[PDB]
Write a protein that binds this ligand. Structure first.
Ligand code: HEM
Ligand code: HEM
Ligand code: PLM
Ligand code: PLM
Lengths: 420, 420
């Protein structure tokens, strides 16, 4: 049983089933599978019992679990993702106060709406693809929502630099570029925070830029302008990432013309309202569940413990299959069908323990992604925006199909689109 | 407009509304009110803008703000409460390192659980009241958590002497007793610290008692053994104080039997454990929010400045309404309702700017209480303990009712309780 790192690069999102299959575990089963990867023992876990385990901070730490080749360029150095104990709780608290606050999310809903409404018209003259153009639109919204005091081009630059990062870090032949993207982005963010603290750059006192500039650590000292800038990115770039979900959502619409028209009816019955449309939210939630984005979640093991008969080791790495539980037939009724009706029946996605496309457990007391609201706020607005008639989504093979073996995958074209 | 010191003694916790009312200010309003008290100009402030102001250490000093009749017996002479500038930052750092460290809080959580679990069993044989008996239990836990090397009698003795202080100070006809209590406690603590420094009494090297005996100031010199004992009390006595919150919490249970049964279910699932129960924790925070303990906070003014049109001058004393802000309908959804559900929606109480029952600014860089963790840890453990069925809280008028004109008020009986 050699190291499974070559298999992970080869299989991509098929790696979870592959290790499951190559271990003799039945299909659709939740049985833990133990295998070596990255020169160490690892156990892939999947299921509701796995989610409760993954977030038991008494047995599961996170620092060092994500390899630096990924955490380095994507999340940045010293980010909230690599923190445990008190230092994390104080950092999440200050960050969930901006992305998880219902008031600030509703403010973002207005920013992302206006930016999208422009594109749908903007495309009519210079059409493009969803992934690239919506990434800029998402970045413009997140930056304006944060109070970033930069020009429009600078906003679009950083937006594409963040979208370029997400496209490159996952491919072994491009991870070197994602390091250059972060190096540039880290410098632009640090300079911004440095000028806010110096008064050269004055921002709104309640803005996200200000709360980042006045960020402090667990010992009560204010973080370095770099870290304050790294963490500002971790509140804007993960929004630019949603353009990949917008691409996936665009494919599902041309594949499900019935639900696409319901959204349309909804937005039509609301005259342009692209936000807070329960139908588009359900479509956005269904896209997050079915389509591949985050393959699995890595975590370290604090002490010798056990999960469902399979024993796991101290200092071991566990992996939570997020694609497998989100589509496990054990936990979902017909997971093969793209059906946003399941998220109109249960709108509170936090009650679904097995719905973990962006994390499980609690968001305030754990590492679960804050701003799933902000993500869906952006994602649902795009579903409503493309639900129109003047918009016709191109359906070439490179527009509708994506590779399951490619990490951070997406339709080749980025899902092209044209508007009349 | 005569001096308002007689009105404060007469009105108690209604004094803030009284000064608000006698100034023509509308009800529930946040308008500052200026009046003379203690032979000097004073301005009562209330609201989020007041909390940010009150802790702007660029405009507000604190030494001399608390009259010696209160600071003297309660906090002790030369305590961290009377410190400004650098000398405070050096002292808080060494003191918040014991009460604000999440690891040490979890250690105290086990002690307060063990001590509370005993009381409910003693009550079966010899029942009493919440205020007095839980004060001893809180003191027994806080002393053992700190590493106090004393017998059971001294632990029980100093604890009741500490609870006696809180009941006696603030009462004009009893403040003389709290001076005698402090003189006794100061001497017992000083003797303890002196024998720890001499090796006559050996304590755990990382215990709170040791970090107090090795306390140093801004001078780089270790504090006098007495002061190390005053500051040791300011990390054990304020825990004995929570028995007043436990008394208030006991009334709220017989007043809200639904949340009481909600906690009961919670503990039953936790297999007896009384700590880290999210339901009991939420119940504990609402008790701290609704019930009167700390009326207002006085502070000195460094330079002439302004708050919402009202000018305040140098050398003035400002008062931050903590009961008025914690129950202002402007800042809370139905603050008249006792609803721990509001603290399940937002568990991070430090993100709530208007929730200031034990301070409002930052705890590490300000004067905010560092024992809010330890406090709720103790208070919620009692909330879980009384949620059982064998526990019957007496509901006579002197058990359920407390005076709002009395300082450091509580039901007269202390909320009596009997268990089968
Ligand atoms: C494309 C949509 C997004 C996806 C797929 C996603 C996914 C994730 C995942 C899987 C985690 C780790 C959860 C865990 O550790 O259990 C995470 C963490 C995080 N996400 Fe997102 N996210 C998205 C959007 C956002 C947005 C819009 C924001 C805020 C602007 C955001 C902010 C964060 C933060 C701050 C963390 C760190 C949490 C912690 O480690 O304590 N994400 N994200
Ligand atoms: C009954 C519950 C408690 C209440 C109502 C309470 C209230 C307060 C208040 C209002 C302050 C001043 C905040 C400010 O200056 O803005 C304070 C300070 C302080 N408290 Fe408490 N407290 C409680 C429990 C505790 C506990 C359990 C501890 C630790 C064992 C503690 C230790 C301290 C210390 C050391 C300070 C000084 C902070 C400073 O002035 O820099 N308190 N408390
Ligand atoms: C062999 C290690 C694999 C472990 C897990 C695979 C890492 C892929 C996870 C993708 C993270 C995507 C985060 C989106 C938001 C952001 O821009 O930060
Ligand atoms: C006339 C001046 C009045 C100003 C405010 C009144 C002072 C009463 C506040 C009581 C403080 C109680 C603190 C409990 C915890 C501890 O033991 O430190």
């Amino acid at each position: 049983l050699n190291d499974q790192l070559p298999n992970f690069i080869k299989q991509g999102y098929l790696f979870m089933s592959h290790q499951r299959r190559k271990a003799g575990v039945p299909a659709d089963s939740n049985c833990p599978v133990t295998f070596p990867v990255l020169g160490g023992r690892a156990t892939l876990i999947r299921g509701e019992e796995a989610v409760d385990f993954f977030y038991d901070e008494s047995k599961i730490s996170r620092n060092g679990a994500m390899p630096t080749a990924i955490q380095g360029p994507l999340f940045g150095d010293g980010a909230v993702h690599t923190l445990d104990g008190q230092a994390h709780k104080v950092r999440k608290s200050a960050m969930a106060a901006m992305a998880y606050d219902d008031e600030r999310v509703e403010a973002f809903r207005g920013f992302v709406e206006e930016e999208m409404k422009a594109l749908i018209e903007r495309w009519k003259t210079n059409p493009g693809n969803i992934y690239d153009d919506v990434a800029v639109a998402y970045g413009r919204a997140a930056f304006r929502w944060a109070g970033v005091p930069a020009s429009d081009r600078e906003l679009n630059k950083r937006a594409t630099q963040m979208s370029h990062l997400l496209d490159t870090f996952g491919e072994v032949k491009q991870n070197v570029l994602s390091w250059m993207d972060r190096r540039k982005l880290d410098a632009w963010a640090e300079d911004l925070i440095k000028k806010v603290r110096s008064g050269e750059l004055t921002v709104d006192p309640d803005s996200v830029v200000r709360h980042m500039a006045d960020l402090r650590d667990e010992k009560g000292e204010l973080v370095t302008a770099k870290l304050a800038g790294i963490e500002l990115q971790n509140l804007t770039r993960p929004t630019v990432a949603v353009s990949r979900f917008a691409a996936f959502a665009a494919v599902a619409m041309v594949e499900n013309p019935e639900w696409a028209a319901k959204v349309k009816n909804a937005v039509e019955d609301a005259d342009g309202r692209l936000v807070n449309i329960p139908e588009a939210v359900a479509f956005a939630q269904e896209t997050r569940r079915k389509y591949p984005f985050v393959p699995m979640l890595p975590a370290m093991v604090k002490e010798d413990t056990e999960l469902s008969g399979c024993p796991i080791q101290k200092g071991q790495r566990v992996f939570l299959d997020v694609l497998g539980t989100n589509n496990s037939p054990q936990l979902w009724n017909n997971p093969g069908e793209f059906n946003p009706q399941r998220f109109l029946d249960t709108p509170d996605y936090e009650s679904i323990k097995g719905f973990i496309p962006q994390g499980g457990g609690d968001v305030l007391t754990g590492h679960r992604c804050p701003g799933e609201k902000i993500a869906v706020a952006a994602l649902s607005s795009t579903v409503a925006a493309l639900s129109a008639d003047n918009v016709t989504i191109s359906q070439e093979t490179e527009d509708t199909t994506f590779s399951m073996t490619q990490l951070l995958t997406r339709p080749r074209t980025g899902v092209r689109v044209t508007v009349s």
